[PDB]
Amino acid sequence: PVKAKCIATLAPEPLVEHKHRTLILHLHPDHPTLLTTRSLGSDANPTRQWIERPTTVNFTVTGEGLEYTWGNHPPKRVWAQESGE
Amino acid sequence: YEHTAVMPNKVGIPYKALVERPGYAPVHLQIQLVNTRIIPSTNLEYITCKYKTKVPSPVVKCCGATQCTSKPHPDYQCQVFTGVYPFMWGGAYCFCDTENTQMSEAYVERSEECSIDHAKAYKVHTGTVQAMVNITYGSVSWRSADVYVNGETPAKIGDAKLIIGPLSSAWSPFDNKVVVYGHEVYNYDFPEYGTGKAGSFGDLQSRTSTSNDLYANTNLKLQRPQAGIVHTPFTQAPSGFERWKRDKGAPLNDVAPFGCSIALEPLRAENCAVGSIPISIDIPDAAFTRISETPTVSDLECKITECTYASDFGGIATVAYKSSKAGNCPIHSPSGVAVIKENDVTLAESGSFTFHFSTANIHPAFKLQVCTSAVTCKGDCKPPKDHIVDYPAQHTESFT
Amino acid sequence: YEHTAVMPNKVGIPYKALVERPGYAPVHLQIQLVNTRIIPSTNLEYITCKYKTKVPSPVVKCCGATQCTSKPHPDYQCQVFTGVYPFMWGGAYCFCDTENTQMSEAYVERSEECSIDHAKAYKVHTGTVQAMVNITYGSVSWRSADVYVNGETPAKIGDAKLIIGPLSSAWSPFDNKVVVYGHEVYNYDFPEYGTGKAGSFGDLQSRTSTSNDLYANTNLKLQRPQAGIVHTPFTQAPSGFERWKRDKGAPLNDVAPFGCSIALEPLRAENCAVGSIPISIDIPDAAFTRISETPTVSDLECKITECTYASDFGGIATVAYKSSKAGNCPIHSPSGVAVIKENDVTLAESGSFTFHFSTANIHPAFKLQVCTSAVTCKGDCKPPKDHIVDYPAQHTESFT
């Protein structure tokens, strides 16, 4: 057994949607995709869920940031400061 | 002029402080902590992996017993058995019918995947954090050097000597006990070398890959082969490395706090944005410009024109520059309210040049130090609309 | 029957507890913590050693200057000098008289002794203590196994499974910061890598022996050679490794508390007698003798005959054994007042056999459990005369 880099997986890109300190994400994979995040406060408040059924989800993003992992697609990151004026 | 500065630990954004040396012209900083890779002190305690019941081929004495001995193989399970009639290619071959004896033996051994696909425990201490700090300094305009955090280490790469930390935010996102797998790192209370219950994680526990000795609590129990046929019932828990790959927990690069990323590399935890770092630099005095050569800018005026109450450098402000000479003029807001994109502004003889910035207070009353000339750029700002992209440049939220 | 037992940490003496399993015959222990080697968690911070001013041979330009540059050698001291007339084997050789230039350069380098004769700093954490515990168990009569202290580790060497500690006496005799030298270990607040003042300890500070980089604050100051002759005045502090060998402090194996010895070996601190260890064993049930096979000894009598109020097993006591069968009978005083040399006594049909012991109370009222038969061996003891030899077997001093 060797450390080959398999030609490997990739899940379709997400639909990013803005709200006030909140990411609505209409999402639509090919296969069951383990999504997960890390609210970068010292309060981690992570989430995990395999997604195979297309699902609009939500994420209470904080002031300092959140990150977002659409499958083995690379991890995203997001500034959600205010939007409530 | 050894410019001490408390400094927030946050990776992807410069920290353009200002050198207020009494006597010569000030110089801006641009300190971008491009990385916060950690590399705690650790110890390889034991690799684990899934077993392989690589059965040695059983003995079959045809008429009478064959006592087994406890060979020193890891988890060497061996049990004599009688009452067989072993069908092997010619029907049976041993002519007795109860004195037909069969001695099954099986030991546990590292898989071939153990070398390569293997979890890996650690006792993790704190160690010492690092960074490839870029400073596009002053007029030097470049140094991208790897540094430490311990508050007496310089790194004379470029021309400047810089001392960092120790940081106050000692949260090692790694716990004391950690399991590691390929790239997914698990802050797991692995039981220990030498103990792991069969089926549970660490049923196989080898010190390293080379280590011929190990601990194999697999509950390997041989049973007698059936109805006078040659084979080896090995009844065994599939590994706690088999599970731990599909009934596991989530990775620390997906559950950590305070903003870290991970690698199976020196076991760093990159970019952990938390707390502050007391950083202090000894600039090369040659890089200074004497005060009598930069234009004096006073008798000026500053005002916002479209302040954006935001993260991206949306805040702007014209400045009625009132110079004496003409040239460059480093700039900074000594108040942390306003973070400015421009370190330096060019000046003709008393012109005007807008800069960009970002704030967090509706009424930004921040001083601006245009190369030894302070000014309040008071005003009012507007909220944006479009907030779903990576991390800010503002990082200055307070009471507003 | 998993015989939990709090147990004093003290090295060179057995601890002959007694297994009171309800149902079968009891069995004695003999737990001798032959070693208490510690091996804390540590980090090699920097080797130091005495420098060697391995001068590179100076330049001598005969008519005009030779500007020096700051080469990256450790503590690369270099200073141009003029005004020479260098006598070299033919009188002088450079025909000028003031334009004769001499550029002296000297850097610091690890001695050849640095590889071998070298102090060695450490940041020392707590780690995990060990022992080669002999138990000449029961009738097993032997196992000499290396164990741990962490209170879930077994070590199935022999036949018994034994769990030790964690000890309550967390005094690491090592301090946080330690210097180490050959065998003499110094719990010294070494200044740090990268900082050590010249002359003071750690004037040379190399990470390891291989490490070409280092920190050499030696205050190496070159002076001009005298009266037109070739040589290199290097004015320098002899090392803080030179001192630290004759104005040092004393070694931790000569100044530690609570009874430790030391080695430049895994950095253990052997035999640290302090506090107690909550030890618990799972005996092999096969080693038990069932209760209906050992003689019942009751209707007996015990009395001292010459009790020695002492450390060596000077206390003795006949016992009017009143047996049923004839054979062996393990013995122990469940009270810690009396420590007994004999684990087991042979018995004919209701004979008498003296044993040896040691106590600390003038009136030793200690129970004696002769294989499920208790008895008070009350009496009175005598002080000895001859107290200058190694350590006791009594270790039971209390209010008397």
UniProtKB/Swiss-Prot annotation, chain A:
Topology relative to the membrane: Single-pass type I membrane protein
Compartments (UniProt record): Virion membrane; Host cell membrane
PTM description: Palmitoylated via thioester bonds. These palmitoylations may induce disruption of the C-terminus transmembrane. This would result in the reorientation of E2 C-terminus from lumenal to cytoplasmic side. N-glycosylated.
Role of this protein: Plays a role in viral attachment to target host cell, by binding to the cell receptor. Synthesized as a p62 precursor which is processed by furin at the cell membrane just before virion budding, giving rise to E2-E1 heterodimer. The p62-E1 heterodimer is stable, whereas E2-E1 is unstable and dissociate at low pH. p62 is processed at the last step, presumably to avoid E1 fusion activation before its final export to cell surface.
Assembly, per entry: Processing of the precursor of protein E3/E2 into E2 and E3 results in a heterodimer of the spike glycoproteins E2 and E1. Spike at virion surface are constituted of three E2-E1 heterodimers. Interacts with 6K protein.
Name of this protein: Spike glycoprotein E2
